[PDB]
Amino acid sequence: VASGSGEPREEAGALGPAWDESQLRSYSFPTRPIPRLSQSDPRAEELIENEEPVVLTDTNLVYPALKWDLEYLQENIGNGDFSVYSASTHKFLYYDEKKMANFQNFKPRSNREEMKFHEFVEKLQDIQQRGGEERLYLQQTLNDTVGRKIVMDFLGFNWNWINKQQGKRGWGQLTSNLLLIGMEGNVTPAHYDEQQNFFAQIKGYKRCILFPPDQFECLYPYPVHHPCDRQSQVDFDNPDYERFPNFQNVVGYETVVGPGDVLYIPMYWWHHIESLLNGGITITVNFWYKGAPTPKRIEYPLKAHQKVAIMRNIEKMLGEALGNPQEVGPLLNTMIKGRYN
Ligand SMILES: O=C(O)CNC(=O)c1ncc(-c2cn(CCCc3ccc(Cl)cc3)nn2)cc1O
Ligand SMILES: [Zn+2]
């Protein structure tokens, strides 16, 4: 179970338990808790330099955004196009649409749709009213388009702190700034990203379950050329242990983040994210940085994330070299069977 869940944190002014574990979903693997530390704490600077997850609790990274809510955003964000994904269920499986023309026989069960902010809230209001079970997840990189109040907020982020982290870790350019607004219960299934991430919680509480790259074997990512590249094939809600036996060996690092917490998700680390049930609307901003460049002459034994990049590159080479990504599997199997297995 979630031994790493944590005894819920008690909010100041004794306004109750921020959340209780009945708002966490039930899963078949154990976990240990991610450390919640202060930014000044050197234990937390060492966790980051060693690419290990840590919850930073007092960065003020997005202090101005803590006032955010739907009303405030609607009135001040502009008339921009905001990507919004629909879903039949709590699970939000996402598809790379450009990879979409390889496989045609894995149909789409979560779809994008541009909206103006007022229409999005519109949709939640009516879904709200009719008690519907459709779920929505807004996910959009904010850009200069936005309102005057929201540019001032963005400018009030603690750029000095994060910009220092980018330099101290030798990381590369901030790639993007997604904003996520999601409904209670919504789940982003387990996946890994190729970039260092600072996951900055604003409104609501999110449960984050991470796994290290070295548990690649237990999480069974889709093929690289598949639309669900970098997602785990394993249904966390009902695992198929015959197809994925080593998911019985998976142990996670877990934590619940709330307003003001910043969760460092090291690159290539798996993460599963859920907005707690009956916790209402969640709001997050993410800060993705190209990771540090790989030194010129490499140190063995390699680290797990480098082996992952290798496997990824093998799949990519073979896809181009064979003229068809769908021959990758067959060739790899003939390479292995009775030779390496
Ligand atoms: O639900 C939560 O709180 C946690 N959600 C996530 O972590 C999350 N992670 C990754 C993606 C994602 C989206 N795309 C499509 C192109 C955008 C892009 C490009 C590069 C990178 Cl590095 C990230 C994003 N590719 N990856 C979406 C997510 O929502
Ligand atoms: Zn991610």
Short mmCIF file of C-alpha atoms and ligand atoms in Angstrom, two decimals:
data_model
loop_
_atom_site.label_atom_id
_atom_site.label_comp_id
_atom_site.label_asym_id
_atom_site.label_seq_id
_atom_site.Cartn_x
_atom_site.Cartn_y
_atom_site.Cartn_z
CA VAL A 1 0.00 0.00 0.00
CA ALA A 2 0.90 3.72 0.20
CA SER A 3 3.11 3.75 3.28
CA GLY A 4 4.68 6.68 1.45
CA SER A 5 1.28 8.38 1.12
CA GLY A 6 1.95 10.22 4.39
CA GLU A 7 -0.21 11.12 7.34
CA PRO A 8 -2.05 14.13 5.87
CA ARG A 9 -0.54 17.55 6.50
CA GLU A 10 -2.56 19.84 8.79
CA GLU A 11 -3.18 23.32 7.40
CA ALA A 12 -2.44 26.45 9.43
CA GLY A 13 -5.12 28.14 11.49
CA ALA A 14 -6.27 24.56 12.28
CA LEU A 15 -8.73 24.57 9.33
CA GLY A 16 -8.69 20.73 9.26
CA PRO A 17 -6.89 17.91 7.40
CA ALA A 18 -6.05 19.24 3.92
CA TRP A 19 -7.08 15.83 2.58
CA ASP A 20 -7.75 12.32 3.87
CA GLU A 21 -6.65 9.06 2.30
CA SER A 22 -10.16 8.18 1.12
CA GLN A 23 -9.36 10.64 -1.71
CA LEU A 24 -6.44 8.51 -2.91
CA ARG A 25 -6.97 5.67 -5.35
CA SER A 26 -6.10 2.09 -4.41
CA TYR A 27 -3.12 0.47 -6.10
CA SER A 28 -1.36 -2.87 -5.97
CA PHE A 29 2.20 -1.75 -5.26
CA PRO A 30 4.02 -0.40 -2.21
CA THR A 31 5.49 3.09 -1.98
CA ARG A 32 7.89 5.11 0.20
CA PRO A 33 7.40 8.90 0.66
CA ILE A 34 9.19 11.63 -1.24
CA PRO A 35 10.91 14.04 1.17
CA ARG A 36 9.26 17.41 1.80
CA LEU A 37 12.13 19.80 2.50
CA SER A 38 12.98 23.52 2.57
CA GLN A 39 14.83 25.09 -0.39
CA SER A 40 17.58 26.23 2.04
CA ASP A 41 18.03 22.66 3.22
CA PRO A 42 21.23 21.28 1.66
CA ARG A 43 19.75 17.77 1.68
CA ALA A 44 17.41 19.11 -1.00
CA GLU A 45 20.20 20.63 -3.11
CA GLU A 46 21.93 17.23 -3.05
CA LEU A 47 18.75 15.39 -4.03
CA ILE A 48 18.49 17.57 -7.13
CA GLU A 49 22.16 17.36 -8.12
CA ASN A 50 21.76 13.57 -7.80
CA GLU A 51 18.60 13.72 -9.92
CA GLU A 52 16.33 12.42 -7.18
CA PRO A 53 12.82 13.72 -6.49
CA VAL A 54 12.16 16.18 -3.68
CA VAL A 55 9.20 18.36 -2.70
CA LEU A 56 10.38 21.93 -2.10
CA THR A 57 7.91 23.64 0.22
CA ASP A 58 8.92 27.33 0.31
CA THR A 59 10.35 28.45 -3.03
CA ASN A 60 7.64 31.06 -3.69
CA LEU A 61 8.20 30.00 -7.29
CA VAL A 62 4.61 30.84 -8.25
CA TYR A 63 3.47 32.79 -5.20
CA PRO A 64 1.43 35.24 -7.36
CA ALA A 65 -0.51 32.36 -8.92
CA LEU A 66 -1.82 31.02 -5.59
CA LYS A 67 -4.66 33.53 -5.85
CA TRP A 68 -5.66 31.92 -9.14
CA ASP A 69 -9.08 30.29 -9.47
CA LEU A 70 -11.46 29.94 -12.45
CA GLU A 71 -13.26 33.30 -12.10
CA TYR A 72 -9.95 35.23 -11.90
CA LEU A 73 -8.50 33.38 -14.92
CA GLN A 74 -11.63 33.79 -17.05
CA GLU A 75 -11.68 37.56 -16.56
CA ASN A 76 -7.95 38.10 -17.12
CA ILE A 77 -6.47 35.47 -19.43
CA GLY A 78 -7.68 36.66 -22.86
CA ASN A 79 -9.41 35.21 -25.92
CA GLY A 80 -6.82 32.59 -26.73
CA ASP A 81 -7.12 29.03 -28.06
CA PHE A 82 -6.61 26.58 -25.19
CA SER A 83 -6.16 22.89 -25.90
CA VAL A 84 -8.64 20.81 -23.91
CA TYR A 85 -8.75 17.02 -23.77
CA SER A 86 -11.98 15.08 -23.26
CA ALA A 87 -12.26 11.71 -21.60
CA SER A 88 -14.73 8.96 -20.85
CA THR A 89 -12.95 8.02 -17.62
CA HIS A 90 -10.62 9.21 -14.88
CA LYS A 91 -7.68 8.01 -17.05
CA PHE A 92 -6.30 10.57 -19.52
CA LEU A 93 -4.23 8.59 -22.00
CA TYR A 94 -2.66 11.03 -24.44
CA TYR A 95 -1.60 10.34 -28.02
CA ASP A 96 1.21 11.91 -30.00
CA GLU A 97 -0.79 12.92 -33.08
CA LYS A 98 2.15 12.96 -35.51
CA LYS A 99 3.02 9.34 -34.63
CA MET A 100 -0.71 8.75 -35.25
CA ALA A 101 -0.23 7.76 -38.92
CA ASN A 102 1.91 4.68 -38.12
CA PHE A 103 -0.73 2.64 -36.24
CA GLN A 104 -4.35 3.05 -37.27
CA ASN A 105 -5.78 0.15 -35.22
CA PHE A 106 -5.40 1.60 -31.69
CA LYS A 107 -8.40 3.96 -31.62
CA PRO A 108 -8.43 7.26 -29.70
CA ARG A 109 -10.32 7.51 -26.42
CA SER A 110 -9.24 11.02 -25.35
CA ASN A 111 -9.39 13.93 -27.77
CA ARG A 112 -8.23 17.54 -28.04
CA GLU A 113 -10.47 20.49 -28.78
CA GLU A 114 -9.57 24.17 -28.89
CA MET A 115 -11.66 26.36 -26.67
CA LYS A 116 -11.87 29.89 -25.37
CA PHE A 117 -11.49 29.89 -21.64
CA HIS A 118 -15.10 30.84 -21.05
CA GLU A 119 -16.27 27.83 -23.06
CA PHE A 120 -14.09 25.47 -21.02
CA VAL A 121 -15.55 26.74 -17.73
CA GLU A 122 -18.90 26.62 -19.53
CA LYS A 123 -18.35 22.88 -20.08
CA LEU A 124 -17.41 22.25 -16.44
CA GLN A 125 -20.42 24.25 -15.29
CA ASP A 126 -22.85 22.16 -17.32
CA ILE A 127 -21.03 18.89 -16.63
CA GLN A 128 -21.30 20.25 -13.11
CA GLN A 129 -25.05 20.75 -13.35
CA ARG A 130 -26.10 17.52 -15.12
CA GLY A 131 -23.83 15.46 -12.88
CA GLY A 132 -22.22 14.07 -16.01
CA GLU A 133 -19.29 11.67 -15.95
CA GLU A 134 -17.37 13.23 -18.83
CA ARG A 135 -14.03 14.57 -17.59
CA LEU A 136 -11.96 17.46 -18.90
CA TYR A 137 -8.30 18.42 -18.63
CA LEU A 138 -7.07 21.78 -19.88
CA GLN A 139 -3.39 21.73 -20.83
CA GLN A 140 -1.85 24.67 -22.64
CA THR A 141 1.51 26.44 -22.76
CA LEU A 142 0.71 30.06 -21.79
CA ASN A 143 2.29 32.62 -24.11
CA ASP A 144 2.40 36.38 -24.46
CA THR A 145 -1.23 36.36 -25.68
CA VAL A 146 -2.55 36.50 -22.16
CA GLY A 147 -4.06 39.27 -20.07
CA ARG A 148 -2.39 42.08 -18.23
CA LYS A 149 -3.05 40.67 -14.73
CA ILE A 150 -1.66 37.27 -15.71
CA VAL A 151 1.53 38.61 -17.28
CA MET A 152 2.17 40.50 -14.02
CA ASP A 153 1.62 37.27 -12.06
CA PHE A 154 3.98 35.37 -14.37
CA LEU A 155 6.55 38.14 -13.92
CA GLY A 156 6.13 37.77 -10.14
CA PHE A 157 7.34 34.18 -10.24
CA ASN A 158 10.60 33.51 -8.37
CA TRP A 159 12.70 33.45 -11.51
CA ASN A 160 15.83 34.15 -9.48
CA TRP A 161 15.49 30.82 -7.66
CA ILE A 162 14.73 28.58 -10.66
CA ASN A 163 17.16 30.36 -12.98
CA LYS A 164 19.86 29.65 -10.38
CA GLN A 165 18.89 25.95 -10.35
CA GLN A 166 19.16 25.86 -14.16
CA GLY A 167 22.69 27.21 -13.92
CA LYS A 168 23.85 25.20 -10.92
CA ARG A 169 22.74 21.98 -12.66
CA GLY A 170 24.12 22.98 -16.06
CA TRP A 171 20.71 22.32 -17.54
CA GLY A 172 19.68 23.80 -20.86
CA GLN A 173 16.88 26.08 -22.00
CA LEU A 174 13.49 26.21 -20.37
CA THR A 175 11.44 24.51 -23.06
CA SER A 176 7.90 25.22 -21.90
CA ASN A 177 5.39 26.24 -19.27
CA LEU A 178 2.32 24.08 -19.32
CA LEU A 179 -0.71 25.09 -17.28
CA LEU A 180 -2.90 22.22 -16.15
CA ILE A 181 -6.47 22.62 -14.94
CA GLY A 182 -8.21 19.36 -14.17
CA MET A 183 -11.23 17.85 -12.48
CA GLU A 184 -11.27 15.87 -9.26
CA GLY A 185 -10.29 12.25 -9.75
CA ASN A 186 -8.55 12.92 -13.06
CA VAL A 187 -5.55 10.67 -13.68
CA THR A 188 -2.51 11.20 -15.88
CA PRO A 189 -1.26 7.60 -16.29
CA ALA A 190 2.33 6.60 -15.67
CA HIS A 191 4.84 8.01 -18.16
CA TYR A 192 8.28 9.54 -18.21
CA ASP A 193 9.52 12.79 -19.73
CA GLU A 194 12.95 13.39 -21.27
CA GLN A 195 13.34 16.73 -19.45
CA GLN A 196 14.01 17.93 -15.96
CA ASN A 197 10.78 19.23 -14.51
CA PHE A 198 9.69 21.60 -11.75
CA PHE A 199 6.02 20.77 -11.04
CA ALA A 200 4.51 23.79 -9.26
CA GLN A 201 1.18 23.24 -7.50
CA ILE A 202 -1.22 26.17 -7.27
CA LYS A 203 -4.77 25.06 -6.47
CA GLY A 204 -5.97 21.74 -5.16
CA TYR A 205 -3.98 18.68 -4.22
CA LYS A 206 -2.33 16.16 -6.51
CA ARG A 207 -0.98 12.74 -5.67
CA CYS A 208 2.26 12.05 -7.53
CA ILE A 209 3.68 8.51 -7.72
CA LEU A 210 7.16 8.36 -9.20
CA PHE A 211 9.44 5.54 -10.23
CA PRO A 212 13.18 5.67 -10.98
CA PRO A 213 14.41 4.98 -14.52
CA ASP A 214 15.90 1.65 -13.33
CA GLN A 215 12.33 0.26 -13.08
CA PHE A 216 11.91 0.48 -16.87
CA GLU A 217 11.60 -3.34 -16.80
CA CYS A 218 8.48 -3.29 -14.59
CA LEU A 219 6.58 -0.54 -16.45
CA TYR A 220 6.57 -1.73 -20.07
CA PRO A 221 6.50 1.47 -22.14
CA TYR A 222 4.75 1.37 -25.51
CA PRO A 223 7.07 1.18 -28.55
CA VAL A 224 8.77 4.46 -29.41
CA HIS A 225 6.93 4.78 -32.73
CA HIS A 226 3.56 4.15 -31.04
CA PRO A 227 1.34 7.21 -30.26
CA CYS A 228 1.64 6.41 -26.49
CA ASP A 229 5.46 6.54 -26.62
CA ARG A 230 6.78 6.98 -23.08
CA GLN A 231 3.59 5.81 -21.33
CA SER A 232 3.38 2.54 -19.47
CA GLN A 233 1.24 -0.10 -21.11
CA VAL A 234 0.15 -1.33 -17.67
CA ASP A 235 -3.34 -0.48 -16.47
CA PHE A 236 -2.63 0.53 -12.87
CA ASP A 237 -6.28 -0.13 -12.00
CA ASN A 238 -6.17 -3.73 -13.25
CA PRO A 239 -2.68 -4.99 -14.07
CA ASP A 240 -2.20 -7.88 -16.50
CA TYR A 241 0.54 -9.77 -14.71
CA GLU A 242 0.73 -12.43 -17.42
CA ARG A 243 1.67 -9.82 -20.02
CA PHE A 244 3.61 -7.63 -17.51
CA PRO A 245 4.93 -9.98 -14.83
CA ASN A 246 7.55 -7.56 -13.50
CA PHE A 247 4.96 -4.94 -12.52
CA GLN A 248 4.74 -7.17 -9.42
CA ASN A 249 8.22 -5.88 -8.51
CA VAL A 250 7.49 -2.15 -8.90
CA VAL A 251 7.93 0.08 -5.87
CA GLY A 252 7.28 3.81 -6.07
CA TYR A 253 8.15 7.13 -4.48
CA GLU A 254 4.97 8.98 -3.54
CA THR A 255 3.68 12.27 -2.19
CA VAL A 256 0.74 14.64 -2.22
CA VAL A 257 1.53 18.22 -3.27
CA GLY A 258 -0.65 21.20 -2.53
CA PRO A 259 -0.60 24.96 -3.11
CA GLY A 260 2.95 26.31 -2.86
CA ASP A 261 4.78 22.98 -3.10
CA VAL A 262 7.25 22.45 -5.94
CA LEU A 263 7.96 18.84 -6.89
CA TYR A 264 11.21 18.22 -8.73
CA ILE A 265 10.58 15.40 -11.22
CA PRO A 266 14.02 14.33 -12.51
CA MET A 267 14.20 13.58 -16.21
CA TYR A 268 13.38 10.02 -17.28
CA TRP A 269 11.63 9.32 -13.93
CA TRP A 270 8.23 7.76 -14.24
CA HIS A 271 5.33 9.69 -12.84
CA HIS A 272 1.67 8.92 -12.28
CA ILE A 273 -0.43 11.92 -11.30
CA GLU A 274 -3.95 12.07 -9.89
CA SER A 275 -6.10 14.96 -8.72
CA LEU A 276 -7.50 13.70 -5.45
CA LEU A 277 -11.08 12.49 -5.53
CA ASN A 278 -13.61 15.07 -4.33
CA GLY A 279 -10.79 17.58 -3.95
CA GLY A 280 -12.31 19.76 -6.66
CA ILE A 281 -10.41 21.64 -9.35
CA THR A 282 -6.62 21.36 -9.53
CA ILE A 283 -4.23 23.88 -11.05
CA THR A 284 -0.54 23.32 -11.79
CA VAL A 285 2.22 24.99 -13.76
CA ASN A 286 5.20 23.01 -15.04
CA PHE A 287 8.68 24.25 -15.95
CA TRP A 288 10.55 21.97 -18.36
CA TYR A 289 14.28 22.35 -19.02
CA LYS A 290 16.41 20.45 -21.49
CA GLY A 291 18.70 18.50 -19.22
CA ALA A 292 22.43 18.99 -18.88
CA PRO A 293 24.49 17.89 -21.90
CA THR A 294 26.22 14.52 -21.82
CA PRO A 295 29.98 14.79 -21.10
CA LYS A 296 32.41 14.04 -23.89
CA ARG A 297 34.07 10.86 -22.64
CA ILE A 298 31.56 8.84 -20.65
CA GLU A 299 31.86 7.26 -17.20
CA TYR A 300 30.85 3.63 -16.82
CA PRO A 301 28.85 1.88 -15.53
CA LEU A 302 26.17 3.93 -17.27
CA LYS A 303 23.14 5.22 -15.39
CA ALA A 304 19.66 3.89 -16.07
CA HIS A 305 18.39 6.95 -17.92
CA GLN A 306 21.28 6.61 -20.38
CA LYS A 307 20.41 2.98 -21.08
CA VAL A 308 16.84 4.16 -21.72
CA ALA A 309 18.03 6.79 -24.21
CA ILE A 310 20.08 4.03 -25.87
CA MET A 311 17.06 1.73 -26.24
CA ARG A 312 15.03 4.68 -27.55
CA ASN A 313 17.74 5.38 -30.13
CA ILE A 314 17.93 1.74 -31.24
CA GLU A 315 14.18 1.76 -31.90
CA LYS A 316 14.46 5.04 -33.79
CA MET A 317 17.41 3.97 -35.98
CA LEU A 318 15.78 0.65 -36.83
CA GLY A 319 12.55 2.43 -37.77
CA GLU A 320 14.19 4.64 -40.39
CA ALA A 321 16.67 2.00 -41.56
CA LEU A 322 13.90 -0.51 -42.31
CA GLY A 323 11.60 2.02 -44.00
CA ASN A 324 8.70 1.03 -41.73
CA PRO A 325 8.47 1.40 -37.93
CA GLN A 326 6.17 -1.64 -37.90
CA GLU A 327 9.03 -3.97 -38.85
CA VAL A 328 10.98 -2.99 -35.73
CA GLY A 329 9.30 -5.58 -33.54
CA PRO A 330 9.74 -8.55 -35.86
CA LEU A 331 13.43 -7.83 -36.48
CA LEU A 332 14.15 -7.30 -32.79
CA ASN A 333 12.51 -10.63 -31.95
CA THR A 334 14.40 -12.60 -34.56
CA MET A 335 17.56 -10.93 -33.11
CA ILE A 336 16.77 -12.16 -29.59
CA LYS A 337 15.00 -15.51 -29.76
CA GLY A 338 17.38 -18.38 -28.95
CA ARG A 339 20.34 -15.95 -29.14
CA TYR A 340 20.04 -13.68 -26.05
CA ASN A 341 17.03 -15.11 -24.20
O1 LIG B 1 -1.33 15.66 -14.76
C1 LIG B 1 -0.26 16.14 -14.30
O2 LIG B 1 -0.29 16.90 -13.30
C2 LIG B 1 1.08 15.78 -14.94
N1 LIG B 1 1.07 15.87 -16.39
C3 LIG B 1 2.33 15.66 -17.06
O3 LIG B 1 3.29 15.43 -16.41
C4 LIG B 1 2.51 15.72 -18.57
N2 LIG B 1 3.68 15.35 -19.06
C5 LIG B 1 3.92 15.37 -20.35
C6 LIG B 1 2.95 15.77 -21.25
C7 LIG B 1 3.26 15.79 -22.59
C8 LIG B 1 2.57 16.47 -23.57
N3 LIG B 1 3.20 16.27 -24.71
C9 LIG B 1 2.81 16.83 -25.99
C10 LIG B 1 3.76 18.01 -26.28
C11 LIG B 1 4.04 18.93 -25.08
C12 LIG B 1 5.30 18.54 -24.28
C13 LIG B 1 6.54 18.46 -24.89
C14 LIG B 1 7.66 18.10 -24.15
C15 LIG B 1 7.54 17.83 -22.80
CL1 LIG B 1 9.00 17.37 -21.87
C16 LIG B 1 6.30 17.91 -22.19
C17 LIG B 1 5.18 18.27 -22.93
N4 LIG B 1 4.30 15.49 -24.48
N5 LIG B 1 4.32 15.21 -23.15
C18 LIG B 1 1.70 16.18 -20.77
C19 LIG B 1 1.48 16.14 -19.40
O4 LIG B 1 0.25 16.53 -18.87
ZN ZN B 2 4.88 14.26 -17.59
#
